[PDB]
Design a protein around this ligand. Structure first.
Ligand code: ZN
Lengths: 70, 121, 208, 118, 71, 125
RNA sequence: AAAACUUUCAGCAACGGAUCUCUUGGCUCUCGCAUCGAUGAAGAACGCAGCGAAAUGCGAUACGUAAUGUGAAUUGCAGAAUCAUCGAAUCUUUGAACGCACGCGCCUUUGGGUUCUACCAAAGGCAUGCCUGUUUGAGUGUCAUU
RNA sequence: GCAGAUCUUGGUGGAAGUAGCUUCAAAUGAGAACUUUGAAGACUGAAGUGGGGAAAGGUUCCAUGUGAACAGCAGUUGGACAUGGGUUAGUCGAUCCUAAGAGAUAGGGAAGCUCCGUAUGAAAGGCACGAUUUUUCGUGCCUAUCGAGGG
RNA sequence: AACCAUCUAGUAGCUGGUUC
RNA sequence: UUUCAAUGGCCCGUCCACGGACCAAGGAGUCUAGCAUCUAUGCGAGUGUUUGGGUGAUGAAAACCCAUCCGCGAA
RNA sequence: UUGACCUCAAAUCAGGUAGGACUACGCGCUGAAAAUAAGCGCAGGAAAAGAAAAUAACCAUGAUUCCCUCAGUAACGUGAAGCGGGAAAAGCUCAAAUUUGAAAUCUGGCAACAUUUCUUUUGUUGUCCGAGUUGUAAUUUCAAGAAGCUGCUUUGAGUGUAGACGAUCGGUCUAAGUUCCUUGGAACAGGACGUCAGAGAGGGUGAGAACCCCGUCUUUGGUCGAUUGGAUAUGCCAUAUAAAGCGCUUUCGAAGAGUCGAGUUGUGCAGCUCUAAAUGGGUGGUCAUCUAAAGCUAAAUAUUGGCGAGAGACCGAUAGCGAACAAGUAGAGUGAUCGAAAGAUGAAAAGAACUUUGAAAAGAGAGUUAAAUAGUACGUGAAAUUGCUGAAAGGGAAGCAUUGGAAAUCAG
């Protein structure tokens, strides 16, 4: 609508298409090599920390927990 | 269509004259158009008009590379040769200057840096 | 919502009463086809619409969490009445029994041939064929709006753990796979009409 | 009833913050996402019967617990130069908060500086 | 006549007697554009011309303003 | 189902992209299938068309005809094949274009630029 | 009670552009990112294709040049591409606009002419406010020198 | 969800075909009351319906072709469009100057866009001399700018 | 004083219309 | 359906007056916050998850789960 | 006679920097008929705020911002804040104390040596000039701290190599009918027979295409790059004659002025008049709490603008942006400003050869096509409105209603 965006609508120059979006942008782990091997690129960080035996936080979790089995 | 790799290994005055030649036919080629010419000659105007551009590009690349080498390792070099990123990028603190710390701040992170630890469970 | 800057831009005010013309704001200037023409009112061409649509409508509706859970339990129970399944529209006259449970080895599938193979053995494949032949182009403006096609609803596969069951059953037209722990109403009661045909893996049933 | 704040970005703010949590700890894996906070008493008559997380452990809490101010911020124990223990109850509740922390902590060794001579 | 061609904005708004264009206020170093004139802003603002340099910059940002030659 | 946020399934944006494709991208939208004997001894399924390639028209009113392509008319997504033509009123012969998906390829124009591609796309030569 | 004229009905034709179906456009939401300029920006004016007036691109290297990528076109007629990519360049007159004005000068170097103490051309220069430094200074400012 | 809003936008009627708005011969041309030539007769009667300029306009100038839009009629017509051509300066003007004034600067106001100020408590422009003077300059003199009748 | 775009969909106790 | 005869029938809206040449499309009690009543649903001395945290691989702005508080009621 | 300085100049002096634009969100200032609009100044990807001259009256809390709650409460129709729940968390730097057994500090010139998004970037080393004692470094920041004594525990502003691991830019690889029968100009349709599916999203192709084509899934990945983030292993240098934490004290503890504040005036701040102190001063309820008049700082937070994406119970050409099209365009006004209308031949121009009449425009034959009831005045083509044809009625109204005849037409 703006003249600026009308310029490249009536222009012939191709856009600067930048391909960025990733559903579930779960950031992969660097830093410690031990954890990076035994990370689960699908499961969440609070699951992975509890899987390894690492306290994700020392302070109480301000919401619910995950209970999959009775 | 003069190949650029052939041109760029020539000499300066050799390129200067070929440019001098390249004006003549293009000057003559337009003269035949106003006086009437054939399709092949009319198409040849465009090819020569790019062939002037190819030679002139080669001269400048040679001329500026001479300045770049002649000015290599000097404190001040011509503005047309320096970085042209952005006025704000050029006036911002260099990483060396942003990295600078007081001697007190070098003792703090020397004897007491951030540790790597782990909470068991 | 329409633009809140719509109708507001083009300038005009009332010409005055007693000139054999209605008193609408009529654009000024000259030499253009637009001049001397009215706007600002829903009744004029290129005129602001009456009560322009706002974005702070009430789009989402709060529901008591308990009646949400009552609804799921009711729709799950209706999923186990064969008669309610037939009115919902599921061709399950040859289904072995209701609720249709399957072995737990189904949760580890790896190919859509296996998925289709199993469905044919339990005679639920009459329902995948129904939702395949019904595939019709949409009627109306919906197809102009990334809603190109419509079709029916197939059997609802419910599992307990995912290891490849979803990746096998998902491409079949009509079939939907849902974890037992996150049972959804839009799939236990499409359109609000009860009794969708469900298929329970052995563990998923034991976890109800 | 002029300019309105409409919350259509509430579900996307929920994930933006989840990804920020994911991005953060992935940079500092072995260590927890958050620091340890003390347990403090709210400052009122409607709330003094409850316990809630503080801002950090005072100078005396760390001194008795066995960490100095400089090495307590490295291993992730925030300090609170404002707060102070007016009674022995708060001292003991938070001294033994750091005691369980220092027991569950694995401080990895760093790189030393060894000059060729003395 | 009362207005001739302004040199900065090209419109014949340059009042000879005041020696100041009504459209853009030349020769003040700034440009005349008021907020109540929102249409007047859009008629002239960035984007109604070539933008030969900003298109250069926006193109060169994607790769990080690199300088040099490919290996 | 496109599980990616990377690609658009908007109809509006897919038609704009098709009809705003540059020649270096139209060159891919103009692919053609390979005939059975070509397909099995090159282990490749299709190929973008190239001038001088020999094709046979599969579908249309010119069904079953063969010929050599004269020019892959890329602006309007058409292929002009030799000795297939329509007769104008005055007596001129203006060839009509067939679409690259309605023709099959029975003979290629092998070049060292094409040979690398064939082994590039999981083939053999 | 004939024909015309007027009116109504039907058929055809005209006028007109409704309805329907469409739709590279709008609007609304969400998401990601931070990048203009004295190294001349935004904007303005002129100009360029074999045949272009618009629009696009571009700057006397003018619908482009170099580089890399793809691998045979362009199309309306008469190592390609009215291609992509973009780390190299070119970027006319202007514009904060900057030698002075809206044409006239000064400064340093270089060149030309079958004309050389004349003439001409060319390239590079000359805005203001401020900061660090430099050199040249001013002062019945302060003071020293047997 | 429309019969109305002196409704909006577009189309369309009646009113209405209503109100209304020099002559001869010859040649060209498919076509002559409006074209061309000759022929007579008129009109303007030098304060021209004449011939030139200034601003202004911008190509309207000229050639050729056309008769789609313009033409209160028509045209074989035009300032119409189509297609080309045309303005040559040492001596003619501008560029050179100032007038009334505008007016940057030195300054001073102003929260500020800005304002005042131009002779103003401004260090505000160069000339000559000399065996070369400690091989480090000594001595002596004088006190903006735009703007059209001037050339 | 006039004009221009805004404030602005300014102000209504009133006029006119308000669809099966 | 068209016409004919017999009988009948003042031009519509509005408040005489004002509007109406004809036609097609457009065109006016809408969205939203608070309160009040009524009916329905869920629960019941309780009740309300959607500020947040968890979780969701298949439409992940949906669904699903929950800690501390807090609102109203319980004098 | 010669020189130190102090202040002030000049230079096309060496090197630099400022201006203008955009302005959705930021911070000011000014300000109407709401601390609003308009005006003015100024920034950044965020800005601002920010490590208490803070609350509270407790079993006390502990920078800032933001959300919920507090709460339509308190105070005076306006309209709080603390506490409470959350999101995020990170702290710090100067001035004021003698380095006095050593200005330990820094800009610049030149000379080298490396490094590089980079011949474009960035430094180190030496060396000379200066800056600076009217104060540049080290040390200290009230949470303290310094100086001693003590005895335990610690240490790189390095540089190569190597591999793993994330981040970006570009290139690159991808399953299965185009098999028969009828319809049609066209098979993408109907039926038959099959396949693929981690792919049955969407689009293209002469009509509804998972299997013709591009893609989609695989991909939360293989591959060749090109730059890079931070760790790990290992090599080479290293100023350690040092620097730092914590016990202890027979020692000391500097703390911001025309500012706080009092009087008055303009709407907490500001102007004028006057003008402080050191257990002092500020703010609360004699106690409590904070320690102003100097400084910096991520994240959570805002985002109608910018660069891109992905959507939608949205609009569908009088709608939706003013603009689906050569739209801020034609155009209008001296000017500021204003500012439109206009989408669709067909699968493919195959845009109507040729003859004939006409000066031309065109017509009539033909011809193209599935179709010219598609001929560019081009999809469909309504109503008003008009022309002809046929029927009917009409003597200063018509229109309509009920009942039947006449003619027309339909059914069962
Ligand atoms: Zn101007």
């Amino acid at each position: 609508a703006n003249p600026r965006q009308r310029n490249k609508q009536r222009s012939g120059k191709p856009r600067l298409t930048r391909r960025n979006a990733n559903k579930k942008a779960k950031a992969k782990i660097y830093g410690n090599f031990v954890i990076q091997q035994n990370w689960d690129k699908h499961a969440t960080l609070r699951q992975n920390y509890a899987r390894l035996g690492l306290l994700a936080t020392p302070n109480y979790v301000t919401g619910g927990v995950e209970k999959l089995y009775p | 269509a003069l190949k650029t790799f052939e041109l760029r290994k020539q000499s300066q005055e050799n390129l200067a004259e070929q440019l001098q030649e390249l004006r003549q036919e293009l000057a003559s080629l337009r003269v035949q158009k106003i006086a009437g010419g054939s399709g092949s000659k009319l198409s040849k105007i465009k090819t020569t008009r790019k062939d002037i551009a190819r030679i002139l590009t080669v001269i400048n690349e040679s001329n500026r590379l001479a300045a770049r080498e002649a000015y290599k390792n000097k404190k001040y070099i011509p503005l047309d040769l320096r970085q042209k990123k952005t006025r704000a990028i050029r006036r911002a603190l260099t990483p060396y200057e942003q990295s600078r710390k007081t001697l007190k701040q070098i003792k703090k992170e020397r004897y007491f840096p951030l540790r790597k630890y782990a909470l068991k469970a | 919502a329409v633009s809140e800057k719509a109708g507001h831009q083009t300038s005009a005010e009332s010409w005055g009463t007693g000139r054999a013309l209605a008193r609408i704001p009529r654009v000024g200037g000259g030499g253009t086809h637009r001049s001397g023409q009215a706007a600002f009112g829903n009744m004029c061409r290129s005129g602001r619409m009456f009560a322009p649509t706002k974005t702070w409508r009430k789009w989402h509706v709060k529901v008591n969490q308990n009646e949400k859970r009552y609804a799921i339990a009711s729709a799950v129970a209706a999923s186990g009445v064969p008669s309610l399944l037939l009115a919902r529209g599921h061709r399950i006259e040859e289904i072995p029994e209701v609720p249709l449970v399957v072995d737990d080895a189904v949760q580890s599938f790896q190919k859509t041939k296996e998925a289709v193979a199993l469905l044919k053995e339990i005679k639920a494949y009459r329902d995948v064929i129904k939702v395949a032949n019904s595939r019709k182009l949409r009627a109306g403006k919906g197809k102009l709006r990334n809603r190109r096609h419509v079709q029916r609803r197939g059997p609802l596969v419910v599992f307990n753990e995912d290891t490849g069951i979803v990746k096998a059953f998902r491409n079949i037209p009509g079939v939907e796979i849902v974890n037992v722990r996150r049972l959804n109403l839009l799939q236990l009661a499409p359109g609000g009409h009860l009794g969708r045909f469900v298929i329970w893996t052995k563990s998923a049933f034991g976890l109800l | 009833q002029r300019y309105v704040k409409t919350w259509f970005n509430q579900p996307g703010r929920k994930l933006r913050r989840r990804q920020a949590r994911q991005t953060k700890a992935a940079k500092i894996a072995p260590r927890p996402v958050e620091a340890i906070r003390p347990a403090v008493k709210p400052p009122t008559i409607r709330y003094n019967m409850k316990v809630r997380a503080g801002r950090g452990f005072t100078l005396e809490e760390l001194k008795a617990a066995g960490v100095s101010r400089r090495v307590a911020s490295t291993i992730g124990i925030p300090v609170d130069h404002r707060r102070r223990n007016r009674s022995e109850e708060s001292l003991q509740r938070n001294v033994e908060r750091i005691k369980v922390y220092l027991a569950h902590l694995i401080v990895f060794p760093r790189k030393a500086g060894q000059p060729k001579k003395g | 006549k009362s207005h001739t061609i302004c040199r900065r904005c090209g419109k014949r708004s340059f009042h000879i007697q005041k020696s100041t264009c009504a459209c853009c206020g030349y020769p003040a170093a700034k440009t005349r554009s008021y907020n109540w004139g929102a249409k007047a802003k859009r008629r002239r603002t960035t984007g109604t011309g070539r933008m030969s340099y900003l298109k250069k910059v926006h193109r060169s940002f994607k790769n990080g303003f690199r300088s040099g030659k490919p290996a | 189902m496109k599980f990616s946020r990377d690609v658009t399934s908007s109809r509006r944006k897919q038609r704009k992209a098709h009809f705003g494709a540059p020649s270096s991208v139209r060159r891919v939208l103009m692919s053609a299938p390979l005939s059975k004997e070509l397909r099995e001894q090159y282990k490749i399924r299709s190929l973008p068309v190239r001038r001088d390639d020999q094709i046979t028209v599969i579908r249309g009113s010119n069904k079953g005809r063969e010929g050599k392509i004269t020019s892959v008319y890329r602006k309007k997504f058409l292929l002009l094949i030799e000795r297939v033509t329509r007769e104008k009123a005055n007596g001129a012969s203006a060839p009509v274009g067939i679409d690259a998906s309605k023709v099959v390829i029975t003979k290629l124009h092998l070049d060292k630029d094409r040979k690398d591609l064939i082994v590039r796309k999981g083939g053999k030569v």
